[PDB]
C-alpha cells in the first residue's frame, strides 16, 4: 500500500486554512397581515383597548 | 485568499416557551446555528497550435480562436457545475406527469409556507424578492422567486388549457405585454417563470435522466456535497411507487447556490512551444459551487439540518 | 503521410500487501490507452497456498480482466513476474483493482505497474 | 377568473392577478394569511394537534 | 471572381479537460474546424421566334414578350434551386399527421436546444435573430428562426383548435 | 483520483557483436522502472552453434537477470527477438550487462533496447 488512488478530495489539504462567514445570516424573513389589521381606533378587526 | 469558506445560518425558534408562572428554565430555547463550508475546485482546458508556417497557411489566427473557444468552454463548465450542484438530491420536490400552472403554484406556496412534497412542514424559503403591498387597505408581503423549467417543461406548460386562461387575462389586463408573442413563459404569481435550456455536451440546461452518471457526477465538488442522488437514479427513486425519463426544474429562493472564491479565469499563452514554432493556449478556474444546505453545528434535529435551503424541485416526464 | 498520435505517457505504479479483499491502484482518465499492465509477486510464498489474485476493473463483477494469478508456490519463475495480454482504451474514467482471495501467506506483496498514454494526440508528418 | 377578467374590462383591481394576490371581492380585500406551522402565524387547519391549539 | 467557395465553422469545444494538478498536455482539445465547397452551376433557357412576317402578323412583339417571361422563368428555377437544395436530405426532422402548432413549438424548441426527432443530440441551430429580454429581471435569450410551410399545412395550421 | 505517475521514460539501445565477455549495455539511474528489456539477434546463426548469451547485471555474479539465450539455431524464429518477463525498479545506479559465452560464430550481433522511465513523479487528478 503506498501509490495507491487516494480519494481525498480538497477537504483533506493540511495547507489550507478555513475561514467563517463575516454574518451570521437569519432565517427568518416572513411578515404577517395581522400588524396592518390591529389598531385602536373603533374601526379595526383586531382593536387595541389602553388599559394602563 | 480563497481558502475554503463557511457561511453560518441562524435558525429561528420554535419552542412552545413558558407559561404564567413556570420557570424559564423548565424550557429553555435553542439557539441553533447551522454551517456549510464550501471547497474550492481546478478544472481548466487547453489547445495545442500547429506549426506557424501551417497556421498561416489554413488562415486560423490561433490565439484569438483559441481565446475564444476556450472561454465559451470556460462559461459552460461553470455554469454546468451550477446546475449540477442545484439538482442533486432533492429534499424537496414535487412530481407531475405534465407542468402545468397548477403546480407551479402549489411550489410557490410550498415556498411561501414551508411544505414538501408530501405536504409536510419544512421551512419557510426565503424568496428573491419580498415587498409590502396593500390589498384596499391591509398591507400583505408577496415573494417573487425564480422558476427554472427544463424546455421539456416549458413546452409542456405552453400547452396547459389554464396557462392560455392567464395568458388571456393578461391580455386583457395588459401587463406581460410580449411573452406570448416572444415565446417566452412570463411572470405568474409574481415569479418569472423561465425556459432554462436543455443540458447537452455543449452548454448548460436543466438536466434529465438521459444524462449519463458519470457525465453529471464530473461536475460535483464531492466534498461540498454529503450525498449524490444523480438525474438517473432521481428517476430510479421516484419509479419505486412507468418507463419514462424524467426531466428537472426548480424554484429558487435567494441564494440556492453558493460560489466561493474567484469565478474569474485565468488565461495562459505559450508561445514557446517547439522552440516558438506551435503554440499552447490554457484556461483555468479555481471556484467552489454548492448548493445552500446547511448542516447543525452542534448536533440538533431542525427541519434546516439536512434539507436544500432554498430549492424545490419540479419534475415532469420529459416528452 | 499525415497521422494522430499520442505524445504523452505515464506509468503507474503500485504496491499491495495481499491481504483478502480489492485495492484501487490505478486511476485511468478517459480515452487513456493502456499499453502495458504487469505484475510483479515481491516474496517467497511458501509451498501449500492457495492466494489468488486477479488484476482487473472495479465496475465489472469480476475482477480479472486484465491478469489472473494463482498457485503462487509453482515454479517460481513464471508466477513472478505476469504481463497482460491486453491493452484497453478507456472509454470513461476507470479504476484498475486487484482482487485478492484465499490468501494464506505472510510477507508477500504485489508491485502492479501500468504504463499508458494520455488521450491527447498531436498530428505528425513523415 | 370571469371576475378577474371584468376587473381588468374596467381596469380596477389593477396587479392582483399579475402578482399572485386576490385583490377585492364586493368592496371586502380577500387576503391569503398563511398556514399556521411551528414558525409563524397563519389560518389554522384540523391538522394541528388539540393541545398545540388550546395552549 | 466567381470561384468554387469555401467558408468555414469553428465547432464548439467538448471535452474534459483537466481538473486539479494534471497538466494540460493530459487531454489536449481538438480546435476543429469544418468546411464546404460549394460549386457553381450554369443554366439557362431559350424562346426561339417565327418567321418576322408571322411575328408582326400576329402583333406579337417576340423579344419584349419573350423577354419578361423568361425573367419569370428564371426567378422560379433559382427559387427551385433553393428549394431543393433546402429540402434535400434532411437529417433532423419532425413527422406529424396534421401541421399543429404543438409541432411547431416542438420544431422551435428543438432547434434551440440541438435535438432530434428521437430526442437523439444535435447542436443548437443559429437563429435568424437573437435577442436578449428581461422577464421580471432574470435575462432570457429569445430566438427567432424562420417556418416555411406550403399551402396545405399552412391549411392544417389554420384548422388547428390551439391555433 | 490522485496518483503520482513517472512522467519521462528514455528507451537506450546497444549492440554487441557476440565475442566472449561481458558488455556494459544500459545504464540506470537509481529509481528507474524498468519496463521493458528486450533482444533482438541480427545475423544467421550457424547450425550446431552452441553459443549462449545472458543478459543481466553487472554487479550479480551470475549475470541473467533479464534474458537467457541458448541454442541460438533450433527454433530460429522464436529465438531472433526475446522479450524479457521481468520488470524492475532501480535502487542504485545499475549497469545491464551481457555476458555471451560459448561464442563460435561470425557476423552474428544482438541489438539490446531497454525502455524505462525516469525516478520523477508527478500528482495527476482524475
Known amino acids: 500500500k503506498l501509490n495507491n488512488i487516494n480519494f ?13 462567514g463575516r454574518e451570521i445570516q437569519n432565517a427568518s424573513w416572513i411578515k404577517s397581515p395581522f400588524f396592518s389589521i390591529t389598531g385602536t381606533g373603533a374601526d379595526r378587526g383586531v382593536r387595541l383597548f389602553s388599559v394602563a | 485568499s480563497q481558502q475554503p469558506f463557511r457561511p453560518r445560518i441562524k435558525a429561528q425558534l420554535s419552542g412552545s416557551g413558558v407559561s404564567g408562572n413556570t420557570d424559564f428554565e423548565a424550557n429553555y ?7 456549510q463550508t464550501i471547497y474550492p475546485d481546478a478544472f481548466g482546458n487547453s489547445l495545442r497550435s500547429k506549426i506557424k508556417a501551417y497556421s498561416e497557411l489554413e488562415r486560423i489566427d490561433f490565439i484569438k480562436e483559441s481565446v475564444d473557444s476556450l ?44 411544505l414538501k412534497g408530501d405536504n409536510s412542514k419544512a421551512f419557510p424559503i426565503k424568496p428573491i424578492r419580498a415587498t ?52 417566452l413563459l412570463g411572470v405568474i404569481d409574481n415569479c418569472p417563470v423561465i425556459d432554462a435550456g436543455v443540458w447537452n455536451k455543449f452548454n448548460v440546461g436543466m438536466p434529465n ?12 465538488n464531492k466534498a461540498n456535497v454529503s450525498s449524490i442522488v444523480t438525474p438517473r437514479q432521481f428517476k430510479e427513486k421516484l419509479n419505486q411507487e412507468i418507463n419514462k425519463e424524467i426531466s428537472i426544474g426548480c424554484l429558487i429562493g435567494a441564494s440556492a447556490v453558493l460560489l466561493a472564491g474567484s469565478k474569474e479565469t485565468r488565461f495562459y499563452i505559450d508561445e514557446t512551444v517547439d522552440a516558438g514554432r506551435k503554440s499552447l493556449v490554457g484556461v483555468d478556474c479555481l471556484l467552489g459551487v454548492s448548493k445552500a444546505r446547511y448542516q447543525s453545528t452542534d448536533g440538533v434535529v431542525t427541519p434546516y439540518d439536512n434539507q436544500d435551503y432554498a430549492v424545490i424541485g419540479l419534475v415532469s416526464d420529459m416528452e | 503521410m499525415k497521422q494522430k498520435v499520442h505524445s504523452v505517457s505515464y506509468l503507474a505504479k503500485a504496491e499491495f500487501k495481499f491481504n483478502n479483499g480489492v ?14 499492465v504487469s505484475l510483479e509477486v515481491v516474496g517467497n510464498p511458501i509451498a501449500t497456498s492457495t492466494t489468488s489474485v486477479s488484476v482487473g476493473f472495479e465496475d465489472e463483477t469480476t475482477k480479472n480482466y486484465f491478469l489472473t494469478l494463482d498457485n503462487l508456490a509453482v515454479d517460481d519463475a513464471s508466477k513472478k513476474h505476469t504481463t497482460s495480454a491486453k491493452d484497453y482504451t478507456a472509454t470513461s474514467n476507470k479504476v484498475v483493482v486487484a482482487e485478492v482471495k484465499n490468501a ?7 508491485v502492479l505497474r501500468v504504463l499508458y498514454f494520455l488521450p491527447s494526440v498531436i498530428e505528425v508528418e513523415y
Not at chain 2, 29 to 35: F, G, K, M, P, T
Not at chain 2, 89 to 109: E, P, S, W
Request: hydrophobic share 40%.
Open chain 2, 209 to 220: 435522466s438521459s444524462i449519463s452518471d458519470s457525465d453529471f457526477m464530473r461536475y460535483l
Open chain 1, 8 to 20: 481525498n478530495n480538497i477537504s483533506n489539504n493540511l495547507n489550507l486554512g478555513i475561514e467563517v
Open chain 3, 23 to 36: 485495492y484501487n491502484l490505478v486511476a485511468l482518465p478517459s480515452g487513456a490507452e493502456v499499453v502495458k
Open chain 2, 29 to 35: 430555547d435553542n439557539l441553533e446555528i447551522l454551517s
Open chain 2, 71 to 114: 472561454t465559451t468552454w470556460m462559461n459552460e463548465e461553470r455554469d454546468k457545475r451550477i446546475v449540477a450542484s442545484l439538482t442533486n438530491d432533492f429534499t424537496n420536490y414535487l412530481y407531475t406527469q405534465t407542468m402545468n400552472v397548477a403546480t407551479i403554484r402549489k411550489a410557490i406556496f410550498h415556498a411561501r409556507n414551508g
Open chain 3, 104 to 110: 494464506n501467506d505472510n510477507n508477500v506483496k504485489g
Open chain 2, 132 to 183: 409590502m403591498q396593500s390589498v384596499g387597505n391591509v398591507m400583505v408581503q408577496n415573494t417573487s422567486y425564480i422558476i427554472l423549467l427544463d424546455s421539456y417543461q416549458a413546452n409542456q406548460l405552453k400547452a396547459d388549457s389554464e396557462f392560455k386562461e392567464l395568458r388571456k387575462l393578461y391580455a386583457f389586463a395588459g401587463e406581460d405585454k410580449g411573452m406570448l408573442y416572444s415565446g
